[PDB]
Tab-separated table of C-alpha atoms and ligand atoms in Angstrom:
chain	number	residue	atom	x	y	z
A	1	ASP	CA	-15.969	43.385	44.081
A	2	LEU	CA	-14.683	43.279	47.556
A	3	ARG	CA	-11.439	41.952	48.832
A	4	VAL	CA	-11.049	38.730	50.776
A	5	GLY	CA	-7.947	37.571	52.661
A	6	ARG	CA	-5.764	40.564	51.653
A	7	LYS	CA	-5.187	39.439	47.902
A	8	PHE	CA	-8.407	37.956	46.686
A	9	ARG	CA	-10.763	39.946	44.667
A	10	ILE	CA	-14.426	38.812	44.300
A	11	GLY	CA	-15.722	38.571	40.763
A	12	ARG	CA	-19.037	37.400	39.197
A	13	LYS	CA	-21.299	35.018	40.936
A	14	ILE	CA	-21.458	31.293	39.947
A	15	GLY	CA	-23.166	30.944	42.438
A	16	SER	CA	-26.110	30.832	44.954
A	17	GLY	CA	-27.010	28.183	47.610
A	18	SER	CA	-28.345	27.224	51.050
A	19	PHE	CA	-25.186	27.882	52.835
A	20	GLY	CA	-24.317	30.973	51.014
A	21	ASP	CA	-22.956	32.022	47.652
A	22	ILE	CA	-19.939	30.987	45.586
A	23	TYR	CA	-18.162	33.376	43.229
A	24	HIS	CA	-15.332	33.700	40.782
A	25	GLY	CA	-12.327	35.303	42.505
A	26	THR	CA	-9.002	36.591	41.474
A	27	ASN	CA	-5.620	36.591	43.195
A	28	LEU	CA	-4.595	40.100	42.612
A	29	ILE	CA	-0.895	39.580	42.947
A	30	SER	CA	-0.568	36.345	40.566
A	31	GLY	CA	-3.737	36.722	38.498
A	32	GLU	CA	-4.859	33.117	39.287
A	33	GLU	CA	-8.540	32.576	38.993
A	34	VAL	CA	-9.917	30.905	42.021
A	35	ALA	CA	-13.374	30.223	43.746
A	36	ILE	CA	-14.612	32.147	46.670
A	37	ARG	CA	-17.459	30.923	48.934
A	38	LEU	CA	-19.357	33.522	51.153
A	39	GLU	CA	-21.563	32.751	54.172
A	40	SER	CA	-23.336	35.368	56.247
A	41	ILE	CA	-22.230	35.474	59.715
A	42	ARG	CA	-25.900	35.926	60.725
A	43	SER	CA	-26.633	32.540	59.336
A	44	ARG	CA	-28.671	30.435	61.750
A	45	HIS	CA	-26.701	27.232	60.953
A	46	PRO	CA	-23.047	28.169	60.092
A	47	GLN	CA	-21.417	25.378	58.004
A	48	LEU	CA	-18.565	27.141	55.977
A	49	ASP	CA	-16.098	27.272	58.908
A	50	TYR	CA	-16.458	23.667	59.434
A	51	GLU	CA	-16.047	22.848	55.944
A	52	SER	CA	-12.888	24.968	55.515
A	53	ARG	CA	-11.526	23.088	58.517
A	54	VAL	CA	-12.364	19.694	56.899
A	55	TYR	CA	-10.774	21.015	53.577
A	56	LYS	CA	-7.622	22.162	55.471
A	57	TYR	CA	-7.325	18.418	57.130
A	58	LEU	CA	-7.611	16.890	53.796
A	59	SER	CA	-5.340	19.218	52.035
A	60	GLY	CA	-2.849	17.758	49.708
A	61	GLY	CA	-4.997	14.635	48.625
A	62	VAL	CA	-5.263	14.089	44.893
A	63	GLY	CA	-8.580	15.526	43.577
A	64	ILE	CA	-9.122	17.385	46.863
A	65	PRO	CA	-9.765	21.149	45.924
A	66	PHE	CA	-6.856	22.925	47.550
A	67	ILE	CA	-7.986	25.518	50.071
A	68	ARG	CA	-5.968	28.887	50.008
A	69	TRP	CA	-7.557	30.864	52.704
A	70	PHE	CA	-10.453	31.011	55.100
A	71	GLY	CA	-11.674	33.398	57.816
A	72	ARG	CA	-13.792	36.380	58.568
A	73	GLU	CA	-14.282	39.379	56.245
A	74	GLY	CA	-16.962	41.887	57.768
A	75	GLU	CA	-20.342	40.352	57.545
A	76	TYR	CA	-19.180	37.163	55.888
A	77	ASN	CA	-17.396	34.018	56.521
A	78	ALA	CA	-15.125	33.411	53.452
A	79	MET	CA	-13.290	30.467	51.828
A	80	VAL	CA	-10.729	30.732	48.943
A	81	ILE	CA	-10.251	27.458	47.102
A	82	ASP	CA	-9.494	26.107	43.671
A	83	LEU	CA	-11.774	26.897	40.872
A	84	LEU	CA	-13.280	23.682	39.345
A	85	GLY	CA	-15.326	22.693	36.306
A	86	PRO	CA	-18.554	21.009	35.747
A	87	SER	CA	-20.303	18.429	37.881
A	88	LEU	CA	-20.850	15.022	36.861
A	89	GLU	CA	-24.601	15.741	37.003
A	90	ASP	CA	-23.895	18.751	34.791
A	91	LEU	CA	-21.982	16.521	32.354
A	92	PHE	CA	-24.686	13.778	32.637
A	93	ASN	CA	-27.240	16.292	31.163
A	94	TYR	CA	-24.888	17.447	28.520
A	95	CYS	CA	-24.776	13.681	27.421
A	96	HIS	CA	-28.509	13.567	27.774
A	97	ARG	CA	-28.629	11.487	30.900
A	98	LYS	CA	-26.652	8.205	29.880
A	99	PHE	CA	-22.862	7.384	30.109
A	100	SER	CA	-21.090	4.678	28.222
A	101	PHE	CA	-19.655	1.721	30.116
A	102	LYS	CA	-16.118	3.049	29.384
A	103	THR	CA	-16.925	6.520	30.991
A	104	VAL	CA	-18.646	4.967	34.017
A	105	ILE	CA	-15.641	2.719	34.489
A	106	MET	CA	-13.142	5.514	34.294
A	107	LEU	CA	-15.199	7.849	36.666
A	108	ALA	CA	-15.439	4.806	39.195
A	109	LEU	CA	-11.755	4.174	39.217
A	110	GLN	CA	-11.102	7.760	40.109
A	111	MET	CA	-13.965	8.227	42.547
A	112	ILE	CA	-12.868	4.922	44.594
A	113	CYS	CA	-9.433	6.557	45.080
A	114	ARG	CA	-11.118	9.790	46.216
A	115	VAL	CA	-13.177	7.992	48.603
A	116	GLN	CA	-10.163	6.024	49.745
A	117	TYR	CA	-8.231	9.113	50.461
A	118	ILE	CA	-10.897	10.643	52.550
A	119	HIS	CA	-11.435	7.470	54.559
A	120	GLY	CA	-7.560	7.469	55.015
A	121	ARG	CA	-7.846	10.803	56.607
A	122	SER	CA	-10.294	9.345	59.189
A	123	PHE	CA	-13.253	11.106	57.592
A	124	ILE	CA	-16.536	10.008	55.806
A	125	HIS	CA	-18.224	12.254	53.162
A	126	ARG	CA	-21.925	11.143	53.837
A	127	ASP	CA	-23.238	13.095	50.866
A	128	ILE	CA	-22.048	11.052	47.921
A	129	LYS	CA	-23.862	12.087	44.890
A	130	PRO	CA	-23.115	13.224	41.143
A	131	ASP	CA	-23.371	16.967	42.198
A	132	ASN	CA	-20.498	16.646	44.670
A	133	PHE	CA	-17.973	15.284	42.038
A	134	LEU	CA	-16.511	18.112	39.661
A	135	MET	CA	-13.977	17.931	36.949
A	136	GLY	CA	-11.038	20.197	36.829
A	137	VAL	CA	-10.845	23.352	34.573
A	138	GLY	CA	-8.507	23.395	31.665
A	139	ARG	CA	-5.827	20.831	31.464
A	140	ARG	CA	-7.170	19.425	34.851
A	141	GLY	CA	-10.486	18.529	33.236
A	142	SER	CA	-9.666	14.763	33.307
A	143	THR	CA	-9.427	14.702	37.156
A	144	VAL	CA	-12.474	14.104	39.119
A	145	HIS	CA	-12.634	16.164	42.367
A	146	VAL	CA	-14.762	15.765	45.479
A	147	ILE	CA	-16.479	18.786	47.013
A	148	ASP	CA	-19.143	19.569	49.782
A	149	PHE	CA	-17.769	18.383	53.077
A	150	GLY	CA	-20.277	20.131	55.160
A	151	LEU	CA	-21.987	16.772	56.192
A	152	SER	CA	-18.757	14.997	56.600
A	153	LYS	CA	-17.658	13.396	59.807
A	154	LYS	CA	-14.700	11.836	61.680
A	155	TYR	CA	-15.480	8.086	61.632
A	156	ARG	CA	-12.474	7.275	63.890
A	157	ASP	CA	-9.954	8.710	66.362
A	158	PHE	CA	-6.828	10.386	64.549
A	159	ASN	CA	-4.334	8.528	66.654
A	160	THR	CA	-5.912	5.257	67.840
A	161	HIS	CA	-8.030	4.574	64.750
A	162	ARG	CA	-10.918	3.536	67.297
A	163	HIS	CA	-14.086	3.493	65.290
A	164	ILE	CA	-17.030	5.711	66.286
A	165	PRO	CA	-19.704	3.508	68.101
A	166	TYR	CA	-22.600	1.839	66.329
A	167	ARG	CA	-25.982	3.790	66.914
A	168	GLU	CA	-29.553	3.636	65.476
A	169	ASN	CA	-32.463	6.241	65.169
A	170	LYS	CA	-30.503	8.806	63.233
A	171	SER	CA	-32.393	11.111	61.192
A	172	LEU	CA	-31.976	11.568	57.357
A	173	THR	CA	-31.600	15.056	55.769
A	174	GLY	CA	-31.313	15.350	51.973
A	175	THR	CA	-32.557	13.794	48.929
A	176	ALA	CA	-31.940	10.033	49.659
A	177	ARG	CA	-31.742	9.098	46.002
A	178	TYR	CA	-28.309	7.800	46.600
A	179	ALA	CA	-28.524	6.985	50.323
A	180	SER	CA	-27.523	3.467	51.496
A	181	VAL	CA	-30.082	1.148	52.872
A	182	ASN	CA	-28.562	1.462	56.324
A	183	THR	CA	-28.827	5.218	56.265
A	184	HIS	CA	-32.512	4.952	55.532
A	185	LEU	CA	-32.727	2.446	58.278
A	186	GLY	CA	-31.221	5.188	60.640
A	187	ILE	CA	-27.904	3.415	61.199
A	188	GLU	CA	-24.870	5.607	62.183
A	189	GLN	CA	-23.206	5.880	58.722
A	190	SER	CA	-19.621	4.548	58.327
A	191	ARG	CA	-17.223	3.795	55.370
A	192	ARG	CA	-19.368	1.167	53.721
A	193	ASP	CA	-22.169	3.756	53.158
A	194	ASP	CA	-19.980	6.234	51.133
A	195	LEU	CA	-19.283	3.142	48.871
A	196	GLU	CA	-22.780	1.963	48.537
A	197	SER	CA	-23.809	5.673	47.572
A	198	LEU	CA	-20.949	5.522	44.800
A	199	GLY	CA	-22.546	2.325	43.593
A	200	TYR	CA	-25.885	3.832	43.053
A	201	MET	CA	-24.465	6.670	41.116
A	202	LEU	CA	-22.617	4.146	38.734
A	203	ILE	CA	-26.029	2.353	38.072
A	204	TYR	CA	-27.661	5.764	37.614
A	205	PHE	CA	-25.047	6.726	35.239
A	206	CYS	CA	-25.282	3.539	33.172
A	207	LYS	CA	-29.016	3.013	33.054
A	208	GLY	CA	-30.000	6.784	33.107
A	209	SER	CA	-32.065	6.591	36.316
A	210	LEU	CA	-32.725	4.660	39.446
A	211	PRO	CA	-35.940	2.984	39.898
A	212	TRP	CA	-36.965	4.946	43.090
A	213	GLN	CA	-36.652	8.475	41.501
A	214	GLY	CA	-39.523	10.802	41.106
A	215	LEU	CA	-41.621	9.564	44.037
A	216	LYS	CA	-44.106	11.736	45.951
A	217	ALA	CA	-45.386	11.376	49.342
A	218	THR	CA	-47.400	13.182	51.951
A	219	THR	CA	-44.593	13.585	54.366
A	220	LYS	CA	-40.749	13.569	54.235
A	221	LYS	CA	-40.622	10.333	56.371
A	222	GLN	CA	-43.090	8.664	54.121
A	223	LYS	CA	-41.006	9.424	50.925
A	224	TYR	CA	-37.778	8.138	52.627
A	225	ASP	CA	-39.437	5.068	53.520
A	226	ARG	CA	-40.955	4.471	50.187
A	227	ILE	CA	-37.489	4.791	48.666
A	228	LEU	CA	-36.133	2.517	51.431
A	229	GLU	CA	-38.844	-0.051	50.525
A	230	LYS	CA	-37.748	-0.054	46.901
A	231	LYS	CA	-34.041	-0.209	47.695
A	232	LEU	CA	-34.763	-3.126	50.040
A	233	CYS	CA	-37.310	-5.156	47.949
A	234	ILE	CA	-35.846	-4.764	44.316
A	235	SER	CA	-33.074	-7.243	44.028
A	236	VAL	CA	-29.622	-6.385	43.088
A	237	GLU	CA	-30.017	-8.367	39.983
A	238	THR	CA	-33.188	-6.502	38.875
A	239	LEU	CA	-31.422	-3.104	39.989
A	240	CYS	CA	-28.444	-4.136	37.749
A	241	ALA	CA	-30.139	-5.669	34.793
A	242	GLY	CA	-28.400	-4.899	31.470
A	243	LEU	CA	-25.075	-4.218	33.484
A	244	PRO	CA	-21.954	-6.513	33.442
A	245	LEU	CA	-21.646	-8.740	36.582
A	246	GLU	CA	-19.112	-6.322	38.330
A	247	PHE	CA	-21.799	-3.721	38.855
A	248	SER	CA	-24.012	-6.105	41.040
A	249	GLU	CA	-20.814	-7.693	42.584
A	250	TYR	CA	-19.774	-3.941	43.713
A	251	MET	CA	-23.272	-3.583	45.224
A	252	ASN	CA	-23.346	-6.968	46.970
A	253	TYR	CA	-19.947	-6.129	48.524
A	254	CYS	CA	-21.077	-2.807	49.799
A	255	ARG	CA	-24.244	-4.137	51.291
A	256	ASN	CA	-22.414	-7.125	53.047
A	257	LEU	CA	-19.793	-4.809	54.715
A	258	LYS	CA	-20.147	-4.628	58.409
A	259	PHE	CA	-20.366	-1.200	60.448
A	260	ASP	CA	-16.752	-0.570	61.533
A	261	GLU	CA	-15.166	-2.843	58.530
A	262	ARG	CA	-12.331	-1.409	56.398
A	263	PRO	CA	-13.269	-1.794	52.811
A	264	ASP	CA	-11.046	-3.679	50.427
A	265	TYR	CA	-10.722	-0.509	47.945
A	266	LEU	CA	-8.193	-2.407	45.661
A	267	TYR	CA	-10.653	-5.346	45.149
A	268	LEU	CA	-13.349	-2.717	44.150
A	269	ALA	CA	-10.866	-0.900	41.679
A	270	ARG	CA	-9.910	-4.307	40.185
A	271	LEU	CA	-13.570	-4.951	39.443
A	272	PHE	CA	-13.575	-2.137	36.929
A	273	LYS	CA	-10.105	-2.317	35.990
A	274	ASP	CA	-10.664	-5.994	35.089
A	275	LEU	CA	-13.864	-4.980	33.188
A	276	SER	CA	-12.202	-2.495	31.049
A	277	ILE	CA	-9.692	-5.083	29.934
A	278	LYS	CA	-12.417	-7.461	29.037
A	279	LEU	CA	-14.202	-4.632	27.140
A	280	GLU	CA	-10.935	-3.458	25.463
A	281	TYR	CA	-11.111	0.081	26.832
A	282	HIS	CA	-7.983	2.094	27.280
A	283	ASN	CA	-7.838	4.094	30.638
A	284	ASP	CA	-7.130	7.242	28.356
A	285	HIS	CA	-9.169	9.971	29.971
A	286	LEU	CA	-11.330	10.292	27.043
A	287	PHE	CA	-14.838	10.755	28.403
A	288	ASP	CA	-18.177	10.734	26.603
A	289	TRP	CA	-18.440	14.496	26.754
A	290	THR	CA	-14.870	14.902	25.634
A	291	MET	CA	-15.518	13.069	22.383
A	292	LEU	CA	-19.097	14.518	21.919
A	293	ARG	CA	-17.675	18.030	22.287
A	294	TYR	CA	-14.915	17.460	19.784
A	295	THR	CA	-17.172	15.855	17.185
A	296	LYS	CA	-19.662	18.816	17.516
A	297	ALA	CA	-16.904	21.399	17.035
A	298	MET	CA	-15.925	19.732	13.706
A	299	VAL	CA	-19.543	19.348	12.600
A	300	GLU	CA	-20.243	22.948	13.264
A	301	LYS	CA	-17.491	23.926	10.912
A	302	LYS	CA	-31.715	20.718	19.698
A	303	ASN	CA	-32.641	17.252	20.685
A	304	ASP	CA	-32.436	16.200	17.147
A	305	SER	CA	-29.079	17.976	16.605
A	306	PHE	CA	-27.482	16.166	19.379
A	307	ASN	CA	-28.424	12.770	18.061
A	308	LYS	CA	-26.802	13.680	14.791
A	309	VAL	CA	-23.649	14.655	16.585
A	310	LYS	CA	-23.758	11.492	18.788
A	311	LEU	CA	-24.183	9.308	15.864
A	312	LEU	CA	-21.078	10.758	14.244
A	313	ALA	CA	-19.119	10.430	17.442
A	314	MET	CA	-20.352	6.896	17.796
A	315	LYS	CA	-18.994	6.133	14.233
A	316	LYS	CA	-15.608	7.869	14.819
A	317	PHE	CA	-15.190	6.276	18.102
A	318	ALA	CA	-16.874	2.994	17.568
A	319	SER	CA	-14.800	1.014	20.199
A	320	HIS	CA	-15.588	3.600	23.011
A	321	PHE	CA	-19.456	3.915	23.155
A	322	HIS	CA	-21.131	0.919	24.487
A	323	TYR	CA	-24.432	1.346	26.333
A	324	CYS	CA	-26.589	-0.578	28.666
A	325	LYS	CA	-29.805	-1.744	26.904
A	326	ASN	CA	-32.503	-1.201	29.613
A	327	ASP	CA	-34.830	-3.995	28.065
A	328	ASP	CA	-31.955	-6.517	29.041
A	329	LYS	CA	-32.868	-8.784	31.839
A	330	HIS	CA	-29.288	-10.243	32.285
A	331	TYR	CA	-25.910	-9.308	32.739
A	332	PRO	CA	-24.455	-8.847	29.301
A	333	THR	CA	-21.103	-10.726	28.573
A	334	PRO	CA	-18.076	-8.641	27.503
A	335	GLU	CA	-18.447	-10.137	23.922
A	336	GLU	CA	-22.119	-9.382	23.949
A	337	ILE	CA	-21.302	-5.453	24.843
A	338	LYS	CA	-18.364	-5.402	22.283
A	339	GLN	CA	-20.793	-6.224	19.527
A	340	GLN	CA	-21.993	-2.638	19.645
A	341	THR	CA	-18.491	-1.622	18.174
A	342	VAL	CA	-19.627	-3.366	14.970
A	343	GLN	CA	-23.208	-1.702	15.097
A	344	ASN	CA	-21.520	1.630	15.723
A	345	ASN	CA	-19.374	1.427	12.586
A	346	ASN	CA	-22.421	0.077	10.520
A	347	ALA	CA	-24.342	3.509	11.005
A	348	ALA	CA	-24.454	6.264	8.347
A	349	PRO	CA	-22.815	11.913	2.645
A	350	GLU	CA	-19.934	14.534	3.087
A	351	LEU	CA	-20.455	14.843	6.861
A	352	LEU	CA	-19.157	11.328	7.692
A	353	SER	CA	-15.950	12.427	5.561
A	354	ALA	CA	-15.682	15.825	7.411
A	355	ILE	CA	-15.114	14.144	10.944
A	356	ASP	CA	-12.093	12.147	10.003
A	357	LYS	CA	-10.241	15.141	9.110
B	401	LIG	N1	-14.508	24.968	43.940
B	401	LIG	C1	-15.357	25.371	43.083
B	401	LIG	N2	-15.227	25.817	41.749
B	401	LIG	C2	-16.065	26.035	40.810
B	401	LIG	N3	-17.471	25.790	41.138
B	401	LIG	C3	-17.808	25.178	42.114
B	401	LIG	C4	-17.014	24.897	43.366
B	401	LIG	N4	-17.604	24.293	44.382
B	401	LIG	C5	-18.887	24.296	43.976
B	401	LIG	N5	-19.051	24.874	42.612
B	401	LIG	C6	-20.200	24.965	41.726
B	401	LIG	O1	-21.119	26.205	42.220
B	401	LIG	C7	-22.397	25.887	41.859
B	401	LIG	C8	-23.226	26.224	43.178
B	401	LIG	O2	-22.755	25.360	44.310
B	401	LIG	P1	-23.507	25.361	45.759
B	401	LIG	O3	-24.447	26.458	45.868
B	401	LIG	O4	-22.398	25.429	46.868
B	401	LIG	O5	-24.209	23.970	45.663
B	401	LIG	P2	-25.713	23.823	45.692
B	401	LIG	O6	-26.291	24.845	44.691
B	401	LIG	O7	-26.174	22.360	45.280
B	401	LIG	O8	-26.231	24.150	47.186
B	401	LIG	C9	-22.693	24.270	41.764
B	401	LIG	O9	-23.088	24.160	40.362
B	401	LIG	C10	-21.311	23.769	42.111
B	401	LIG	O10	-20.970	22.756	41.054
């Protein structure tokens, strides 16, 4: 309950982590709810100061949490920033670990823009994963935000745009579930790698998992290298089985980019915009969790309970909920996928009547 940056009061924890804790905070003058991150100054590997400085440099971008204050408060490095909502991994779990094509397409459109803005500010993220994308709170709940810039890096000179040099034998640090093949190989990360990681997330979201998940090994390196072998040896076709051709096209593009090459962000956005048209989706910010949450509220006026809610939701929103069929070996046609609209309507008392109201 101490004060930070004169006017920010620390409240309840949100909260804990490896680089410190994150708290609810309040601006004592305006009453605005914010987020406050703390890092012990006795930390052996300080990261908060770095992140705050990246956040400052990125300040003003759409979907970049807006830093309000950072500095020193006694025994703590502190950072005051926008309060955000659930992560996409959180929402993935809420939806029982599968997203519709529509929701994945809509996330992809926003996330490509976020990554584009970050690259436009001469930084690469280097830690692209579902946990690092959060929705806004309240009415900002339709905007995907990017967080966690502790591993981010300048990939080019601010004035000359001279790219950092090519390099090998770089070490790998985290879970490498979403890491690019070239990261695994020890190559200096560049813009392409952020986008490849984004690609794996999309496939993850669609299919419910990646085929190199849940591996065990005797050492970290062995595990990393087992993941690398699967990424390398499983074809893009197999990887993207059951998904419209855009998803494998997205992946082939990222894997084919050269080290210092500027990505064609608009080409990639057009992939998913064109697909949403073929699938007759509106870009209406109506995500799976939005509609499941609404449906549930009306019903209430645990695995088995969810399935009933989901059934009603898919009936009321038949044209919105299309899913990958993981037994598929091919890329389904748009008309193939849209056939699920009919199936959704054909599913089945007073409860079906209640929801319309
Ligand atoms: N600006 C923010 N507003 C609200 N919640 C946040 C913000 N930044 C991170 N979080 C959330 O706080 C929780 C703890 O985050 P943190 O400890 O930094 O990550 P991790 O636990 O993965 O190391 C996470 O669930 C994360 O989604």
